[PDB]
Design a protein around this ligand. Structure first.
Ligand SMILES: *[C@@H]1O[C@H](CO)[C@@H](O[C@@H]2O[C@H](CO)[C@@H](O)[C@H](O)[C@H]2NC(C)=O)[C@H](O)[C@H]1NC(C)=O
Length: 50
């Protein structure tokens, strides 16, 4: 699903950022997309079940 449009300090379209959230693999931190602390966009909150 979509995310809620967060604050980005790069020039992005806030109307269409909702479809660009990181891919949801396994239920790790950042849904297995990254082992970094913070990603460039927030992972959707339903990643534990989806
Ligand atoms: C844009 O990036 C962040 C938010 O996306 C801005 O705020 C910093 O966020 C980091 C993340 O934890 C904090 O540690 C800093 O204290 C924040 N404040 C700063 C750096 O003043 C950040 O200010 C923005 N960077 C720009 C505009 O260059």
């Amino acid at each position: 699903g979509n995310i809620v449009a967060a604050n980005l300090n790069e020039s992005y379209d806030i109307n269409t950022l909702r479809s660009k959230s990181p891919m949801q693999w396994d239920n790790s931190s950042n849904a297995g997309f990254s082992e970094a602390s913070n990603t460039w966009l927030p992972t959707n909150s339903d990643y534990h079940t989806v």
